[PDB]
C-alpha cells in the first residue's frame, strides 16, 4: 500500500496471523542484495526459521502440506534449505507446538 519508506516489506503480509505480524529479527536490505534475495528473517521458532524475499515468488514444495507453494515467505528446517515449508503449515506447526517434531 505504499513505498518502503512508509510500509516495510514484511508488513505486506500483515493480514495473515503468526510471526509475520512481528518485526523480523534480521534485515538484509541496507547492506547488500543476497543471491537468494531473502530480505527479512524472523527469530527461530524452534528449529524452524522464517524468511521473506524481495521477489515475485519462489515456487517451492513444503514437506508438511506437500503442495507446491508460490510465496515470498519460506520456512526452513534447521537451516537446511532443501526442506522448505510454506507459511500456512509453519503457523499451524507453531500453533500446535510441533516445531521440533516435523
Q: Verify binding: residue 65, Zn ion, rule CB under 5 A.
A: yes
Which of the 8 DSSP states describes residue 94? Answer: H
Does 62 contact Zn ion by CB under 5 A? yes
User: Which whole-number Å values give the CA distances from 34 to 11, 37, 63, in the listed order?
Assistant: 20, 5, 25
Q: Is 89 in the site for Zn ion (CB under 5 A)?
A: yes
List Cα–Cα distances, 11 to 27, 38, 65, in angstroms: 13, 15, 25
How many CB atoms neighbour CB 68 within 10 A?
10
Residue 6 binding: pick among another protein, Zn ion, none (C-beta 5-8 Å cut-off by kind):
none
Residue 26 touches which member of another protein, Zn ion, none, C-beta under 5-8 Å by kind: none
Binding site partner of 86, from another protein, Zn ion, none, Cβ cut-off 5-8 A by kind: Zn ion
Residues engaged in binding another protein (CB under 8 A): 28, 32, 34-38, 47, 55-61, 77-84, 96-98, 101
Stretch that binds Zn ion, among 11-19, 26-34, 80-88, 91-99 (CB under 5 A): 80-88
User: At a CB cut-off of 8 Å and minimum separation 6, what does 19 contact?
Assistant: 42, 43, 45, 50, 90, 91, 94
Binding residues for Zn ion, per CB under 5 A? 62, 64-65, 86, 89
Amino acid at each position: 500500500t505504499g513505498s518502503p519508506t512508509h510500509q516495510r516489506e514484511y508488513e505486506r503480509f500483515h493480514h495473515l496471523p503468526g510471526d509475520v505480524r512481528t518485526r523480523p529479527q534480521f534485515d538484509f536490505t541496507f547492506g547488500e542484495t543476497r543471491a537468494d534475495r531473502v530480505m527479512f528473517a524472523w527469530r527461530k521458532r524452534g528449529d524452524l526459521q522464517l524468511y521473506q524475499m524481495s521477489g515475485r515468488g519462489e515456487t517451492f514444495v513444503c514437506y508438511r502440506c506437500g503442495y507446491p507453494v508460490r510465496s515470498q515467505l519460506v520456512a526452513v528446517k534447521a537451516d537446511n534449505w532443501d526442506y522448505r515449508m510454506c507459511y500456512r503449515c509453519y503457523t499451524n506447526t507453531v500453533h500446535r507446538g510441533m516445531e521440533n517434531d516435523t
